[PDB]
């Protein structure tokens, strides 16, 4: 349950906020994506 | 070879696909045996 940001390589759910640095629980590589939404997305079949 | 001298970190050995995403500069250092 719950996830905030992910890493460009070692896709490990992180989670932060201001000043808490912008790195990862290991890999220095300071990228990070902001994982999907909770509210489902609805599509049409055409 | 490629490097990234940023304050709050040493000098990260850089790679293409990153400089790309982070808008950086895929360049490396230049040194010269200067004489006194
Ligand atoms: Zn990481």
UniProtKB/Swiss-Prot annotation, chain A:
Purpose of the protein: DNA-dependent RNA polymerases catalyze the transcription of DNA into RNA using the four ribonucleoside triphosphates as substrates. Common component of RNA polymerases I, II and III which synthesize ribosomal RNA precursors, mRNA precursors and many functional non-coding RNAs, and a small RNAs, such as 5S rRNA and tRNAs, respectively. RNA polymerases are composed of mobile elements that move relative to each other. In Pol II, the core element with the central large cleft comprises RPB3, RBP10, RPB11, RPB12 and regions of RPB1 and RPB2 forming the active center.
Post-translational modification: The N-terminus is blocked.
One term of GO molecular function: DNA binding
Organism encoding this protein: Saccharomyces cerevisiae (strain ATCC 204508 / S288c) (Baker's yeast)
Zinc finger (C4-type): 7-27
Record-annotated membrane-spanning stretches: none
Family from the record: Belongs to the archaeal Rpo12/eukaryotic RPC10 RNA polymerase subunit family.
Subcellular location: Nucleus, Nucleolus; Peroxisome
Signal sequence annotation: none
Full-protein positions shown: 25 to 70 of 70
Additional notes on this entry: Present with 907 molecules/cell in log phase SD medium.
Ligand binding (Zn(2+)): 7, 10, 24, 27
Record-level GO cellular component terms: cytoplasm; nucleolus; nucleoplasm; nucleus; peroxisome; RNA polymerase I complex; RNA polymerase II, core complex; RNA polymerase III complex
GO-annotated biological processes: nucleolar large rRNA transcription by RNA polymerase I; ribosome biogenesis; RNA-templated transcription; termination of RNA polymerase I transcription; termination of RNA polymerase III transcription; transcription by RNA polymerase I; transcription by RNA polymerase II; transcription by RNA polymerase III
Source organism phylogeny: Eukaryota, Fungi, Dikarya, Ascomycota, Saccharomycotina
Protein's name in the database: DNA-directed RNA polymerases I, II, and III subunit RPABC4
Keyword terms: DNA-directed RNA polymerase, Metal-binding, Nucleus, Peroxisome, Ribosome biogenesis, Transcription, Zinc, Zinc-finger
Quaternary data: Component of the RNA polymerase I (Pol I), RNA polymerase II (Pol II) and RNA polymerase III (Pol III) complexes. Component of the RNA polymerase I (Pol I) complex consisting of 14 subunits: RPA135, RPA190, RPC40, RPA14, RPB5, RPO26, RPA43, RPB8, RPA12, RPB10, RPC19, RPC10, RPA49 and RPA34. The complex is composed of a horseshoe-shaped core containing ten subunits (RPA135, RPA190, RPB5, RPO26, RPB8, RPB10, RPC10, RPA12, RPC19 and RPC40) where RPA135 and RPA190 form the DNA-binding cleft.
Swiss-Prot record, chain B:
Disulfide bonds: none
Lineage: superkingdom: Eukaryota
N-terminal signal peptide: none
Subcellular location(s) of the protein: Nucleus
Other observations noted: The binding of ribonucleoside triphosphate to the RNA polymerase II transcribing complex probably involves a two-step mechanism. The initial binding seems to occur at the entry (E) site and involves a magnesium ion coordinated by three conserved aspartate residues of the two largest RNA Pol II subunits. Present with 18700 molecules/cell in log phase SD medium.
Family of this protein: Belongs to the RNA polymerase beta chain family.
Subunit field text: Component of the RNA polymerase II (Pol II) complex consisting of 12 subunits.
Known role: DNA-dependent RNA polymerase catalyzes the transcription of DNA into RNA using the four ribonucleoside triphosphates as substrates. Second largest component of RNA polymerases II which synthesizes mRNA precursors and many functional non-coding RNAs. Proposed to contribute to the polymerase catalytic activity and forms the polymerase active center together with the largest subunit. Pol II is the central component of the basal RNA polymerase II transcription machinery.
Protein's name in the database: DNA-directed RNA polymerase II subunit RPB2
UniProt source species: Saccharomyces cerevisiae (strain ATCC 204508 / S288c)
